[PDB]
Amino acid sequence: YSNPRESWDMWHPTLVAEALFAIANIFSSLRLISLFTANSHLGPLQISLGRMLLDILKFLFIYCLVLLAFANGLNQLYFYYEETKGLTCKGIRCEKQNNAFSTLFETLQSLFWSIFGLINLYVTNVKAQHEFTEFVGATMFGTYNVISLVVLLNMLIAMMNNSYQLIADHADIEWKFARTK
Amino acid sequence: AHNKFHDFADRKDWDAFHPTLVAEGLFAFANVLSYLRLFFMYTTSSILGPLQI
Numbered sequence: 001y002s003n004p005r006e007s008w009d010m011w012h013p014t015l016v017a018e019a020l021f022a023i024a025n026i027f028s029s030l031r032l033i034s035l036f037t038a039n040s041h042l043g044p045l046q047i048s049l050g051r052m053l054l055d056i057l058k059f060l061f062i063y064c065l066v067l068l069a070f071a072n073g074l075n076q077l078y079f080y081y082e083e084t085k086g087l088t089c090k091g092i093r094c095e096k097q098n099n100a101f102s103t104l105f106e107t108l109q110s111l112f113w114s115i116f117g118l119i120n121l122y123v124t125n126v127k128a129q130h131e132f133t134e135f136v137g138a139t140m141f142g143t144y145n146v147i148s149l150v151v152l153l154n155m156l157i158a159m160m161n162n163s164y165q166l167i168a169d170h171a172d173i174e175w176k177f178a179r180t181k
Numbered sequence: 182a183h184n185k186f187h188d189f190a191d192r193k194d195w196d197a198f199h200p201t202l203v204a205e206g207l208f209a210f211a212n213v214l215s216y217l218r219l220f221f222m223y224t225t226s227s228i229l230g231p232l233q234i
């Protein structure tokens with residue numbers, strides 16, 4: 001395969017090479033964190049973050065269960081209302097959000113981004129006038145937001161607090177062991 | 182709804198409080214609860230148990 005750039009297919013080998021180089025670059029530029037065990041002022045800090053990253057993953061499993069539950073519930077609600085209408089863009093990543101809870105992939109993406117507030121509130125109403133389904137979808141969306149933005153995040157903060165309180169005493173010997181390695 | 186309402190029309194033509202819409206809404210609520218039931222399976226694990234407890 002050796003033409004304007006917009007005519008390229010979405011799975012062109014050069015575009016895949018571009019994206020894989022980008023991900024390899026964000027993985028290569030994070031290796032300087034491993035270079036920070038030698039420094040005395042912040043080596044224990046980096047070591048402590050490395051300790052409680054495992055507990056972070058421990059809690060992210062529970063988050064993944066909650067995310068799957070609410071995502072497939074919202075998909076089972078809204079996917080009967082799939083529409084195209086010849087729109088310029090579909091999905092959450094448009095100027096105007098549409099078909100957010102359309103498929104399971106789009107629902108998982110839309111519920112993930114709702115933690116950071118980048119999904120507006122006009123995704124819960126349908127273009128039709130079925131008010132009851134709109135209300136129960138907005139209720140499910142608000143319930144998941146309440147969970148993953150009040151319950152689970154603050155549980156994560158308190159659990160991180162106790163974990164760093166526990167590993168603050170053993171941070172020095174851990175940093176010395178990592179620096180000797 | 183299967184016994185009573187079988188009028189061939191588009192989905193947007195229906196009433197807001199039709200039994201089919203209520204049935205799918207309660208089905209979605211039941212699905213959220215069914216998928217959230219899996220938290221009580223985590224207690225048998227030696228890793229995810231104490232955190233959920």
Ligand SMILES: Cn1c(=O)n(CCCO)c(=O)c2c1nc(Oc1cccc(OC(F)(F)F)c1)n2Cc1ccc(Cl)cc1
Pocket residue numbers: 135138139140141142143146150
């Ligand atoms: C779950 N839930 C929800 O989904 N929606 C969106 C529905 C469609 O918009 C809501 O508006 C909504 C809601 N719970 C609500 O009261 C809370 C109860 C418990 C916790 C909470 O929050 C937090 F934990 F304290 F932070 C909020 N309210 C507000 C409300 C609205 C109407 C009436 Cl009569 C009474 C209360």
